[PDB]
């Protein structure tokens, strides 16, 4: 019983982290193979105005990078850059490399991130991929480079390397691949996201949480069109509802369908008269129906 | 910026994770050096009544054990009962133990869980020891035996091993010395948990994380003494107001002093009428001190 905010094991990335020192920038890269990737900005000559990373790769220089993995310093041997970020060539092949892929995030998935510091773990949490693009995540100067991740399929699959913080507070990194989520840039200019959505599937999978928990006061019996619903959700920062699958399962299983929930959802956001549903006093939407799933059935989808 | 509940990082204890089978029962284990720590009740025959452990480890005999590391046996060469937890000795070292402790949590105190099912890990999350000694986590059958615990100054401390849920769905564990938290029983009648209190400290915490970010449409100019505050909150549901000296970090870089934050509390306790804070739309307790310094600033 139960539901909460959960991150999948750190191990097998912890041991990919390395520090990458270029000058006087110190950030983080991930150490697959004989490649080590990090943001490309830890080259940039300066952090107050507009970069021209053509020019900054063209005066690199090799001997000014210093990357350490614990206690050992790895070989630099080349260098090349991709979108945002450079993939650096080094003599080194880290043993400790998982199976592994690379993977680009889409709207409202979920993920990990290890946040990193000085090439060093500091903690990991769960954060989705929100519908703007961003992610809320909490990091401080340093945490460039730290990695997104999740395990699946005996493998792991890397998707997201931080990159930067909006004015917002909000975070942004790029796919391992050098493209940055949502378009943004790697420069210090003023950026504005668009508005967040809120993720109907999530609040739906939170709602269905809640019932498997015995939490069912707000529950009533009338119900709302898929259609309508999605009308509705448009004009007030809701995504509109779709998967189905799962959650037709999920309906068949406590018996409750989709459309009361839909009703709830409509109804709830207008607030929880102060109860809460499940520790929370106000909709969820950071629990996928993959996390519920697998939290309450231990059942991956 | 932002504020975040999160999980120190696993590494150094997923090595740690063996499969403890017993008889017609298969939980996890924590392997340090020579020994393997679990959950007595692995040992217990049938559990429809009360278990009488006394009988269950006189009965026990060593070579109903199948202890298993990823897809290693480990050879049992021993066994006794500490409290509700077995201390089984194995023929060799866990190459992997790191430099570690065992410590008993004190009331609201933050940890991690590594949970953990056929001995191995499946997620990791943060969480506090609650005032009625219990945990508001995520598990599933066959989580049994999987470890809390904390990273500090070079070393892991373990402080939880998962035991059992109530009927109220709330957790409960005990340390390794074997003690159960709380005092609950691992026993199958029907066992119900104190009312448990929001953490003062952690709320101001919160309050603090808010101002560092930009949120402090709450923020007055009222100042509540902690004397006062603490009569409210025996009343309330809250706890006692306690070292507000450890508090001087975040009131000098936000020049907001405790007492300010109290009367909030009592005020902010009546709702946010539509507003949040930090994505919020009530007082929340889960961070402590600790974590909001080390996320605002980086400091331990």
């Known amino acids: 019983a139960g539901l909460r905010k959960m991150a999948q094991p750190s191990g097998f990335v912890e041991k990919c982290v390395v520090r990458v020192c270029y000058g006087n920038t110190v950030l983080n890269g991930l150490w697959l193979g004989d490649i080590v990737y990090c943001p490309r900005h830890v080259i940039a000559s300066n952090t107050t105005s507009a970069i021209d990373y053509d020019h900054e790769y063209s005066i690199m220089r090799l001997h000014n990078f210093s990357?350490?993995?614990g206690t050992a310093f790895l070989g630099v041997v080349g260098a090349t850059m991709h979108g945002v970020t450079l993939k650096i060539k080094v003599s080194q092949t880290n043993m400790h490399t998982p199976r592994h892929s690379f993977r680009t995030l889409k709207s409202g998935e979920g993920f990990n991130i290890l946040a990193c510091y000085d090439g060093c773990a500091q903690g990991v949490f769960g954060v989705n991929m929100r519908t703007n693009w961003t992610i809320r995540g909490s990091f401080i100067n340093g945490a460039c480079g730290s990695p997104g991740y999740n395990l699946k399929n005996g493998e792991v699959e890397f998707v997201y390397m931080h990159q930067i913080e909006l004015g917002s507070g909000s975070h942004v990194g790029?796919?391992?691949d050098g493209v940055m989520?949502?378009?943004f840039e790697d420069q210090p200019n003023l950026?504005?996201?668009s508005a967040n959505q809120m993720l109907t599937?999530?609040?739906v999978a939170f709602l269905y949480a809640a019932i498997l928990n015995g939490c069912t006061w707000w529950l009533k019996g009338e119900k709302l069109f898929v259609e309508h619903y999605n009308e509705w959700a448009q004009a007030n920062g809701f995504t509109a509802m779709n998967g189905e699958?799962?959650?037709?399962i999920l309906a068949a299983k406590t018996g409750v369908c989709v459309e009361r929930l839909l009703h709830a959802i409509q109804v709830l956001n207008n607030g929880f008269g102060g109860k809460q549903i499940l520790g929370y006093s106000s909709l969820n939407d950071e629990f996928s129906i993959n996390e519920v799933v697998?939290?309450?059935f231990?059942?991956?989808l």
């Open 201 to 203: 599937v999530n609040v």
């Open 191 to 193: 950026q504005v996201e």
């Open 298 to 300: 231990g059942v991956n």
């Open 294 to 296: 697998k939290q309450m």
């Open 245 to 248: 699958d799962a959650f037709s």
């Open 181 to 183: 989520y949502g378009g």
């Open 174 to 176: 790029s796919s391992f």
């Open 67 to 69: 990357i350490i993995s």
